[PDB]
């Protein structure tokens, strides 16, 4: 997880997060650059999956039993969220806008 957290943001991102989490992976050489770079089209790709492994701290904090002012005094619930950023083409003509390829 440290690889996603630090290495790629250090190499080919604008900055590095200062909080725990926010694991990123981008095919492009610069996420902030508006100019297109290396990327893959998931439309022509078959089923793709992402596998994630939890941590002993997470599995012990999921249950309660924590003492006072420990945060995990009550059982804790987690959720997984994934966001994807892509490119698209918009065309302006005849006083109107629309996607030529959608």
């Amino acid at each position: 997880v440290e690889y996603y957290s630090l290495v790629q943001p250090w190499y080919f991102s604008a900055s590095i997060p200062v909080y725990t989490g926010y694991h990123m992976y981008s095919y492009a050489l610069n996420v902030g650059s508006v100019h297109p770079s290396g990327s893959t089209n998931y439309g022509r790709l078959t089923n793709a999956s992402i596998t994630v492994t939890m941590s002993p701290e997470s599995v012990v904090a999921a249950a309660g039993g924590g003492n006072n002012n420990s945060g995990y005094n009550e059982p804790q619930r987690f959720a997984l969220v994934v966001i994807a950023v892509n490119h698209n083409v918009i065309r302006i003509m005849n006083g109107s806008m629309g996607f030529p390829i959608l």
């Binding site: 095919y27 050489l29 297109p36 893959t40 089209n41 439309g43 022509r44 790709l45 390829i101």
Partner: protein
């Protein structure tokens, strides 16, 4: 002699992934490429602090 296996299957799959949007964004003979930096001469000079 050894036996090495050129590129990665995942990279080959990503390269094979190609549609109209990718054809519009990339490709073409006139398209420039990375990993190659053009070099041009620069003027010759020196600098020095002065009281």
């Amino acid at each position: 002699t050894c036996t090495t296996g050129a590129g990665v299957t995942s990279g080959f799959i990503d390269l094979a992934t190609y549609d109209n949007l990718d054809r519009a964004l990339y490709g073409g003979k006139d398209a420039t490429t990375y990993f190659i930096k053009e070099h041009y001469p620069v003027g010759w000079f020196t600098k020095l602090p002065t009281m």
